[PDB]
Amino acid sequence: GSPLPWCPHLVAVCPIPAAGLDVTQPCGDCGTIQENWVCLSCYQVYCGRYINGHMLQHHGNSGHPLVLSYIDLSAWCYYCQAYVHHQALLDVKNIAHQNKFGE
Ligand SMILES: O=C(O)CCc1nc2ccccc2c2nc(=O)c(Cc3ccccc3)nn12
Ligand SMILES: [Cl-]
Ligand SMILES: [Zn+2]
Ligand SMILES: [Zn+2]
Ligand SMILES: [Zn+2]
């Protein structure tokens, strides 16, 4: 489609845990190491919809809106049904990028 420069769910993006991110963390439900996302509200890690859809499940059972892909570090908002680019996402995207690419 077309990514958004903002969305009304950015307010749900929470502080990154001091433990940091582990981009190789497995899905908290199924333990897959593939195509995981991290929830930008509670930082639980769950798999994408092309694996077992545990992140989508987490959205449904928590309402948490925004998730970050450990594949390509894009942010998707489940409510807006769009990718979102915004300043509020840069820190988490960068901590993820550093952990991922060994920076
Ligand atoms: O997998 C998740 O749970 C999080 C990501 C996700 N969830 C959805 C849930 C319901 C309806 C639509 C989507 C959705 N549509 C998309 O285009 C994208 C981006 C994208 C991903 C992969 C290849 C190309 C584009 N992510 N996306
Ligand atoms: Cl912590
Ligand atoms: Zn899973
Ligand atoms: Zn969450
Ligand atoms: Zn949104």
Pull the structure tokens for residue 12. Answer: 């749900």
* CB neighbours of residue 34 within 10 Å: 14
The residue whose CA has the least distance to atom 2 of ligand 1 is: 48
Ligand of minimum distance to the alpha carbon of 75: 1
Domain assignments of the chain as residue spans, ordered by start:
1-103
Binding residues for Zn(2+): 7, 9, 27, 30, 39, 42, 47, 54, 58, 64, 77, 80
SS3 of residue 29 by DSSP:
coil
Amino acid at 8: P
Resolution expressed in Å: 1.6
The rounded Å distance from CA 17 to ligand 5 centre is 22
Query: Which letter, b or e, does each residue of 78-88 get, where b requires 16 or more Cβ atoms within 10 Å of its Cβ?
Result: bebeeebbeeb
Rounded CA gap, 36 and 19, in Å? 18
> Within the chain, where are the H helices?
54-62, 90-101
CATH number assigned to the domain covering 1-103: 3.30.40.10
